[PDB]
Amino acid sequence: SFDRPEIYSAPVLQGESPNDDDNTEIIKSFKNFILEFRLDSQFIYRDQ
Amino acid sequence: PRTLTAQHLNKLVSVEGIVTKTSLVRPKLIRSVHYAAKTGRFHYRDYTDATTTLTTRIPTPAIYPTEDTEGNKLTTEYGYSTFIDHQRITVQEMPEMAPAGQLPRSIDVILDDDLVDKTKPGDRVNVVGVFKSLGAGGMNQIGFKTLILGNTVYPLHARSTGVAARQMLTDFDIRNINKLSKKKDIFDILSQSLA
Amino acid sequence: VIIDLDDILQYQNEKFLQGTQADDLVSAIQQNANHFTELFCRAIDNNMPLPTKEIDYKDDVLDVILNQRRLRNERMLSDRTNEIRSENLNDALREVVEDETELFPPNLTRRYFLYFKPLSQNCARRYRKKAISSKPLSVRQIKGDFLGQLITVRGIITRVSDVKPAVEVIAYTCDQCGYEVFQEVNSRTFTPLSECTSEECSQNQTKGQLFMSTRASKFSAFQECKIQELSQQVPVGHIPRSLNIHVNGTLVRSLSPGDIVDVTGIFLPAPYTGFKALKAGLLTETYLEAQFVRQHKKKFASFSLTSDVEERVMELITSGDVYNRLAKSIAPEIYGNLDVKKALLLLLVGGVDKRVGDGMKIRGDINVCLMGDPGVAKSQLLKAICKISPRGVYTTGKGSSGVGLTAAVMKDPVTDEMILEGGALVLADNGICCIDEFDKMDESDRTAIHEVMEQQTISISKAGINTTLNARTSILAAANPLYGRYNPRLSPLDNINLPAALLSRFDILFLMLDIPSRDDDEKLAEHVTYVHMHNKQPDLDFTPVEPSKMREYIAYAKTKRPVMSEAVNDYVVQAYIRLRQDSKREMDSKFSFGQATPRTLLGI
Amino acid sequence: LRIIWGTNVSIQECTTNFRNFLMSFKYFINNTTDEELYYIKQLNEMRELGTSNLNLDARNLLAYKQTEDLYHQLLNYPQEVISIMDQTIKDCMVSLEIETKFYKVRPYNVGSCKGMRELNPNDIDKLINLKGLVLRSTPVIPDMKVAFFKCNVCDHTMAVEIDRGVIQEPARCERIDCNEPNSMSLIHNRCSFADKQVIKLQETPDFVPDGQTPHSISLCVYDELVDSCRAGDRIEVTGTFRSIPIRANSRQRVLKSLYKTYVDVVHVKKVSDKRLDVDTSTIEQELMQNKVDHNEVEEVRQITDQDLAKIREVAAREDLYSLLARSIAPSIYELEDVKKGILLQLFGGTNKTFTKGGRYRGDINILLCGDPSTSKSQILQYVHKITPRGVYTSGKGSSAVGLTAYITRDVDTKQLVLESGALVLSDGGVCCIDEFDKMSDSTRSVLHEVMEQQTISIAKAGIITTLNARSSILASANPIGSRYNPNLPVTENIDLPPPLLSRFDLVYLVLDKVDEKNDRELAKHLTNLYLEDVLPVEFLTMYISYAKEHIHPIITEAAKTELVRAYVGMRKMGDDSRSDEKRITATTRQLESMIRLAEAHAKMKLKNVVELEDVQEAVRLIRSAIKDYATDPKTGKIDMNLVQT
Ligand SMILES: Nc1ncnc2c1ncn2[C@@H]1O[C@H](COP(=O)(O)OP(=O)(O)O)[C@@H](O)[C@H]1O
Ligand SMILES: [Mg+2]
Ligand SMILES: [Zn+2]
Ligand SMILES: [Zn+2]
């Protein structure tokens, strides 16, 4: 009469160097774009 | 066990014989209680089987809950659940009533809860209960599964056997037993009556 | 960490004299004990002091990884706080960082164990409470009402399994991402993972392959013990029953076969393992989870001289006369026989073992044999000496024959290994063995006794066995003369069945005859009839030392090794010369059990 | 200070720390070898000899201040430390083929520890050492390293490397032209394999806690250390402590939570200072195979020339025979005649091989009859512990099956295998049978063939073959009744058929007499031991091994004359007292006994020539053992007034 076992994780090491067409790199590049891209002197998308 | 046939199924019977083997008393789970640390609430469930009600019901095969109605993980509370004990015994015809040189006949008795540890192997016994047919005898795809659901179990005493003999003493009996003592020839009267 | 509930009771009764409020924590710990392990475990992680010894090169392999992981933990929180401050999107910052990051959970950074110590009866009788926990119980009395509770048992240990690792959390390493996956196991069989379950691998189409890292995994020390009922608890006419006990952590290697113990455990269910055709409902099996072990007879090895052992061994000696005092403290209901009991005490204490050089040994433990006519209380003495010794076994002639003495080959249910099960001689190692009806044994059984008394090892060469058992045991034996009574018309060796070579190996041989004497009989009868009327011994100017206090003094005595000088050597040489000169004239006329030998000098 | 994750190791730190020690090591101290640069001689001689294995003792490092750290680190992370230690060597070697040859280290002095069963789960992946007796070993098992794949549509062949046990099978052909899904097939005999063997060891620890029955352990030896251990060998092994999960059954991929334990062996030691060296006469072809296999497991010990000079310096001594007899058992106050028999039993006779088939061996068999309460029992124990291979048996505790062979079920593979018995395990050693007179006629039957031809023939279900049992027999028997009775003949005092008594080379009657100056000396001897010249154990064993190894004695005509004369004289005696079994009748085995004892005495003192003194000493010993200098040849009685201590 026991319970449900769990699976969990945690970062340890540097894996293989990242290919630029990786999904996570795409997500990170698009997150940089959101908070970085400027037109004039106003950061349009963060404000939006 | 020899004269018990298929025309007595579904009736209350009395069976005589000798106990030949008993099984280990095991717990049976009825109600299980749980805890959710994300909501502070306790949940329960019920379980049942075919050997607890004398009439046929439509089965309900419920499952063991590990998860909440939202997905919260539940801890199992072993001390708050309810368990009821179980045992099975086999009966056979007594050696001094059975036909000589012939193989013996036996019957299975199911006992639960309070009647679970009343006898030991090698005892003369009388059992009363319902002679039940169970399951489907291969018609979903030997015959039917037959057993007795015990309600009464009486130990009996016989010559050269491990079950003792005791009688209930009436107060009238006690009065004679105590009256006899004062007379100072108790030893002689009791001694001369020995065979 | 051993939690004592007698502490919890004092704390809650302190929160009642001062008048504050509290909760009944003891009963909740008692009736649902499996949750409070984790409640306590995490409460103690929250309350933790700091380390004060910089990790060095003399520290365990486990501690290196445990220390490393906490540094790796704090590094990522600092890292992400910096990176969050970078984009400039002191309290909500913590709640953001907490959720944004992945850390090692508490379990893979602990290193301590937590057990519960039952509620003592002495403490429960002071504050007026009823201790369900320290009450012992048989094996029959434990029913389905007792599942999930904290209970104590009384029984005798029949089998103990070796120590093997039990996996609790398996560790995996992914080469594609560099994360670490931790799988939980709580069954007897599990299925290993194949693909990665990390966040990165879970997102990207390319998913790495898992490999097992043995060192990081979570392992526990596991043992399984069988416990049987005592004779005085079995009903009339029934057979004794059994039960299973589990042990984890630093509580392993504490129970050994043949011990009488009281075990504190948590009664928990397991899945059914019987026949399918005989299954009706949700049937389950039971087992016990060990937390605290008590032994009724403390072993001599454990002896460590603290200040209360000082106190009572310091009173024992202040009254002097120790030799006679503890010689008459063996079976104070048996009349007479002081010289036999003086020899018994010395067999209980022992001697000195000598590694002479070249790794050759001399035995330093004494063997005693008793002969006599019927009804002189030999068996009662054997029973008593088996009750006083920490390890000691009582056996009768023909009921213990063959593999019941030496050893047997059986397959281990738990570890699936071929083990050797010990007999009486192997259960009494570092103890006293008591054999009754010595003259009736088989020749095969007598050869083994011969070997054990000479060199303290048993050699077996049978199908499937070529080994040598290590058996350090002292022998106490009883035997009747061949014709029932002693015939002084016949020679001394004509009255004893055993060969003289066996009797030449016993250090001291006592002959207990029954010659009717009118005067002594009235003093023996007085004692016996007094005993049957009062359940105490008849002497009011003598204190019988309790068995525990005798065991303590014997252990402290056994922690000493005296040595011999030259002046004492002269005496022994001179006495041996005269004894050797005198024994020959007695053996020539056929009026001795034995001619003097070097073994008599070793016995002296 | 880069630290490898999960460890405290810095690779560069340890490599540089190790090369200074390897290029400079220090240490009743000499000035020839104890104060020279040690390890560069070891490396140079290695490369000169054409060798690949360096054997690295361990406690060397717990003194030199730098590498102390490395000792603790080596006893905790053997995997990572041993790869650092090899790169030091192949760097150090060219610093002094050596660009394509691989070097290895083998630690063999890890200490402490107290047995396998005292180890906890926190000792996994650690280095430990073991001692014990070998019982079984499975045949070689092939282990795959590189696999072979063929494309069944294009015939392009690929090779893959095992990575921590797993093989990656390509899904698509690699050819740019033929790109098919799932076209790769495995050809088993084109793959590269390696060696694996499993040994079972009976552990013999020093500390045995109360009530431990013996158990068995599993050891895995790979590559070079294959067939380096044989059943009956007492060995010392260094290795790592592992664990592994097992599958519940063949059909399912499910595993069991309780783990299984074993040891990965790195070094094996088959020598001891305190025990004798194995008989090279019985392992001739294993020596040849070891050289062909290039395994540097050393079987015999090294002899320097100072020690060999000592050997002849002592061998020149006038009282060599008394000195050797005295140093056999330096704590058993006893007649030197008894000890001399054990001394000559150890040397053994000359083994002779005919080139037309037909083998003559030189094993000596001794019986120790006599009163109880003597020191016979200690002699057997002492001889058990000085001989390299042996088993100790009781009288009424043995079966024919337990002495010859048997079939058993292996709990690992669940199949039936053959296992050795007591006498076959004692091949080239001493077997000690205690209480020989208490043994059944069925069990005594098997000893006839071992005492005649030194073989055993088994015709059982599964095996029909002849086995080699080249063992020495040392037996002790109990006299009938309380004591030896001088008034009766010897054939009436020992419960053994008179024909069996003649198969033994020496029969020792140990008699007890009451005499005041013997008793005084024995009592002083015993009491001196409970307080607080002879040859120590090491030198005795070294001398005996040297003699047993090199010299080989051959007999001359002057000895032949005396041998024939002595045999005829012995037979002519008691010619009338043959019908009545009063004395032990003389047979041809006594002639062979004289031959064997003369050869053994020649081997002692390092001669290759058996002269007349040897035969005279042999006959003297044979008569003195049976106490023929006090026996009345008509009645068979001993005058105890003439039996002097
Ligand atoms: N000296 C004695 N003192 C007290 N009780 C005795 C004495 N001698 C015999 N008995 C009693 O008589 C019985 C003798 O039984 P047992 O010990 O088996 O004797 P034995 O060993 O000689 O056969 C026991 O009940 C014992 O208590
Ligand atoms: Mg008795
Ligand atoms: Zn991954
Ligand atoms: Zn292709």
mmCIF file of N, CA, C and O and ligand atoms in Angstrom, chain D residues 151 153-154 156 173 175 178 180 183-184, ligand 4:
data_model
loop_
_atom_site.group_PDB
_atom_site.id
_atom_site.type_symbol
_atom_site.label_atom_id
_atom_site.label_comp_id
_atom_site.label_asym_id
_atom_site.label_seq_id
_atom_site.Cartn_x
_atom_site.Cartn_y
_atom_site.Cartn_z
ATOM 1 N N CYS D 151 25.999 -3.412 -44.284
ATOM 2 C CA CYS D 151 24.787 -2.934 -44.968
ATOM 3 C C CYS D 151 24.354 -4.032 -45.938
ATOM 4 O O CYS D 151 25.133 -4.451 -46.704
ATOM 5 N N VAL D 153 22.160 -3.881 -48.299
ATOM 6 C CA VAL D 153 21.777 -3.330 -49.636
ATOM 7 C C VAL D 153 23.012 -2.759 -50.363
ATOM 8 O O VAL D 153 22.943 -2.636 -51.576
ATOM 9 N N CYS D 154 24.136 -2.503 -49.701
ATOM 10 C CA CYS D 154 25.335 -1.839 -50.304
ATOM 11 C C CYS D 154 26.687 -2.452 -49.875
ATOM 12 O O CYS D 154 27.665 -2.024 -50.451
ATOM 13 N N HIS D 156 28.615 -1.968 -47.238
ATOM 14 C CA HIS D 156 29.530 -1.013 -46.558
ATOM 15 C C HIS D 156 29.640 -1.486 -45.096
ATOM 16 O O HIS D 156 28.613 -1.675 -44.450
ATOM 17 N N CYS D 173 22.424 3.958 -43.260
ATOM 18 C CA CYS D 173 23.722 3.672 -43.879
ATOM 19 C C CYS D 173 24.469 4.999 -43.937
ATOM 20 O O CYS D 173 23.840 6.037 -44.056
ATOM 21 N N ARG D 175 26.885 5.734 -46.263
ATOM 22 C CA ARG D 175 27.258 6.068 -47.661
ATOM 23 C C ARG D 175 26.325 7.193 -48.091
ATOM 24 O O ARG D 175 25.145 7.099 -47.793
ATOM 25 N N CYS D 178 23.908 5.277 -50.861
ATOM 26 C CA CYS D 178 22.932 4.335 -50.228
ATOM 27 C C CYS D 178 22.587 4.889 -48.866
ATOM 28 O O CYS D 178 23.449 4.789 -48.016
ATOM 29 N N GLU D 180 19.676 4.222 -46.537
ATOM 30 C CA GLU D 180 18.482 3.457 -46.235
ATOM 31 C C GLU D 180 18.176 3.510 -44.745
ATOM 32 O O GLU D 180 19.081 3.648 -43.921
ATOM 33 N N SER D 183 19.214 -0.818 -42.344
ATOM 34 C CA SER D 183 19.878 -1.793 -43.257
ATOM 35 C C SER D 183 21.092 -2.426 -42.574
ATOM 36 O O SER D 183 21.816 -3.174 -43.207
ATOM 37 N N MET D 184 21.298 -2.195 -41.293
ATOM 38 C CA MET D 184 22.539 -2.610 -40.598
ATOM 39 C C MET D 184 22.336 -3.971 -39.941
ATOM 40 O O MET D 184 21.350 -4.103 -39.224
HETATM 41 ZN ZN ZN E 4 23.909 0.935 -47.435
#
